[PDB]
Design an enzyme around this catalytic site. Sequence first.
Site, PDB file in Angstrom:
ATOM      1  N   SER A 102     -88.315  -8.615  17.874  1.00 25.55           N
ATOM      2  CA  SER A 102     -89.242  -8.072  18.837  1.00 25.55           C
ATOM      3  C   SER A 102     -90.296  -8.865  19.387  1.00 25.55           C
ATOM      4  O   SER A 102     -90.165 -10.141  19.625  1.00 25.55           O
ATOM      5  CB  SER A 102     -89.363  -6.596  18.618  1.00 25.55           C
ATOM      6  N   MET A 103     -91.451  -8.479  19.215  1.00 26.68           N
ATOM      7  CA  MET A 103     -92.537  -9.047  19.664  1.00 26.68           C
ATOM      8  C   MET A 103     -92.761 -10.528  18.965  1.00 26.68           C
ATOM      9  O   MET A 103     -93.418 -11.496  19.235  1.00 26.68           O
ATOM     10  CB  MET A 103     -94.021  -8.688  19.675  1.00 26.68           C
ATOM     11  N   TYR A 110     -94.066  -5.478  16.485  1.00 26.93           N
ATOM     12  CA  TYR A 110     -95.263  -4.506  16.608  1.00 26.93           C
ATOM     13  C   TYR A 110     -95.078  -3.387  15.504  1.00 26.93           C
ATOM     14  O   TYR A 110     -94.269  -2.758  15.455  1.00 26.93           O
ATOM     15  CB  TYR A 110     -95.188  -3.934  17.894  1.00 26.93           C
ATOM     16  N   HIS A 121     -82.521  -1.063  18.214  1.00 26.58           N
ATOM     17  CA  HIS A 121     -83.490  -2.336  18.114  1.00 26.58           C
ATOM     18  C   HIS A 121     -83.528  -2.806  16.926  1.00 26.58           C
ATOM     19  O   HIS A 121     -84.046  -3.954  16.743  1.00 26.58           O
ATOM     20  CB  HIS A 121     -84.764  -1.685  18.410  1.00 26.58           C
ATOM     21  N   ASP A 147     -80.530  -1.556  22.614  1.00 25.19           N
ATOM     22  CA  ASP A 147     -81.868  -1.621  22.285  1.00 25.19           C
ATOM     23  C   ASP A 147     -82.838  -0.822  23.568  1.00 25.19           C
ATOM     24  O   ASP A 147     -82.608  -1.306  24.660  1.00 25.19           O
ATOM     25  CB  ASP A 147     -82.252  -3.241  22.447  1.00 25.19           C
ATOM     26  N   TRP A 194     -88.798  -9.698  22.452  1.00 26.34           N
ATOM     27  CA  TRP A 194     -89.696  -8.945  23.510  1.00 26.34           C
ATOM     28  C   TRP A 194     -90.633 -10.083  23.976  1.00 26.34           C
ATOM     29  O   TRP A 194     -91.311 -10.562  23.087  1.00 26.34           O
ATOM     30  CB  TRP A 194     -90.355  -7.668  23.112  1.00 26.34           C
TER      31      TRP A 194
END
Length: 268
Positions: free
Chosen positions: A132-133, A59, A208, A177, A157
Amino acid sequence: TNPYQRGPDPTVSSLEATRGPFSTSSFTVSRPSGYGAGTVYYPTNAGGKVGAIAVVPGYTARQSSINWWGPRLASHGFVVITIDTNSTLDQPSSRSSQQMAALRQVVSLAGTSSSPIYNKVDTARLGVMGWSMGGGGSLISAKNNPSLRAAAPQAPWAQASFSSVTVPTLIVSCENDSIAPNSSHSFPFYNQMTRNKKANLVINGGSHSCANSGNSDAGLIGKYGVAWMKRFMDDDTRYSKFLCGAEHQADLSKRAVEAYKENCPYLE
């Protein structure tokens, strides 16, 4: 005997190096189809067709976060597309759709005589990565497209469950994270996956961004990403020892390895 095997017998030094053995080049996708932007990284002398991997950022992020993977994987014998999403604010399902769109455009360009990757890609051998996403999107891609050969997300994520995944999946996690905390994301996803070959590398002290471009553990992280993609995209059992054998065991004493989980051995 293995038609997909490419390159010299790997060593620890060769997998920790900033570049693999193959010469590489890159180009920007002129007209991205179903995603925002892309850069394609490819080997010029791999010794046969190679698999392709699509890498997606998290993101707000762009190609720069994740594009160290482009030359690192391409120089070991892969076509890699690093993407920007249609919006920096896209969520994991959308990121997964875009990731698969990027793979589909690499397949399209492999059939386009004007493209630098014309006839360079085995369009049946495709893999997914992302942060992540974009890492959650990779796991969604694998859940929805079980013909993918490999997934290797970093700090994933998602608000989804992955018990159905049959794709060989390596999760790279960052111990500290706060954005995709492992107790809510990486570790539940790893535990949910009962049907696949899997591993979870946890980087000691990592924030992260611990697997992003410029990270200080790129020798270690890049060794695992490349060995995972070689083992599963190419069926290249020369790489097994770095995942499950003596070479792997030697890594476990490193300060940078907080934890390593796996279901070795990985049988054919």
